[PDB]
Design a binder for this molecule. Structure first.
Ligand SMILES: [Mg+2]
Ligand SMILES: [Mg+2]
Ligand SMILES: [Mg+2]
Ligand SMILES: [Mg+2]
Ligand SMILES: [Mg+2]
Ligand SMILES: [Mg+2]
Ligand SMILES: [Mg+2]
Ligand SMILES: [Mg+2]
Ligand SMILES: [Mg+2]
Ligand SMILES: [Mg+2]
Ligand SMILES: [Mg+2]
Ligand SMILES: [Mg+2]
Ligand SMILES: [Mg+2]
Ligand SMILES: [Mg+2]
Ligand SMILES: [Mg+2]
Length: 126
RNA sequence: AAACUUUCAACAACGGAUCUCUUGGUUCUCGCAUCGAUGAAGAACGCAGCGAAAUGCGAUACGUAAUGUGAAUUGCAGAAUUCCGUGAAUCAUCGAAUCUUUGAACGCACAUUGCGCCCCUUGGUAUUCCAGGGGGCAUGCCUGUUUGAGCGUCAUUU
């Protein structure tokens, strides 16, 4: 239950705040949990998702597939992961949009800001 | 007997009801006090690699700076060794700037993209003419400054 008179339980307001979120807010909204191995290694549970992250799909119809995130398509709230495609009938190959909450990060793209982000969230960085 | 006409069903039409949704409205409550001659509200015209609008901006033109975040944007195209970085982004924030023609709108005028005058500077053999660049020139009122006007009026003068 809500205890503060600053946040809203209004469903209409929550949906406007989701669907009209700018990209810097959608980055936090498009978070993805880590794997068992990375959660043991880094001490933290979920991070905002990145391009060069390696992921495993754990839901839907492409579950159990691997790849690198080809694109974080924040305008569609989606991630496009290579090796996860739809073969069209003309021979074209279109990327299937995935949600990061149905993904599991199995290898992070680490740089200085990601390391500081892990340490900020309390992570082991090991 | 058909055709025709009528009724009913199924399927197909016409049409967009019903149901289920909802980034909208409505009403109540709480908190706050902030437009403009330092040029507002409003208007017109423009601005994007491909845009008519909406939204945003002003010839620095869907923006510049600065700061925070930290890798997007994307409908295509392009750029993406910049990506362990004073650093992507139609991102957030926003204290520095720009801000066309206007508009209370302020040289005058305006059904004109009309006509002046002043200063500095530049070019044309130029203080005077023509041109370009920059800066000015409204009204009422207040305080002050300077220059004045009035036998309104006081001293001082062979
Ligand atoms: Mg990070
Ligand atoms: Mg009301
Ligand atoms: Mg203006
Ligand atoms: Mg205005
Ligand atoms: Mg209008
Ligand atoms: Mg433009
Ligand atoms: Mg437009
Ligand atoms: Mg600019
Ligand atoms: Mg940007
Ligand atoms: Mg913005
Ligand atoms: Mg300018
Ligand atoms: Mg402006
Ligand atoms: Mg005239
Ligand atoms: Mg005329
Ligand atoms: Mg006066």
């Amino acid at each position: 239950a809500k205890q503060s008179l600053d946040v809203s339980s209004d469903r209409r307001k929550a949906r406007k705040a989701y669907f009209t979120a700018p990209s810097s807010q959608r980055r936090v909204l498009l978070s993805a949990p880590l794997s068992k191995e990375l959660r043991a290694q880094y001490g933290i549970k979920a991070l905002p998702i990145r391009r060069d992250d390696e992921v495993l799909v754990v839901r839907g119809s492409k579950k159990g597939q691997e790849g690198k995130i080809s694109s974080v398509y924040r305008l569609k709230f989606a991630v496009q992961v290579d090796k996860v495609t739809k073969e069209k009938v003309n021979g074209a190959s279109v990327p299937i949009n995935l949600h990061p909450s149905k993904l599991v990060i199995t290898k992070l793209h680490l740089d200085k800001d990601r390391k500081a982000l892990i340490q900020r969230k309390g992570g082991k960085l090991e």
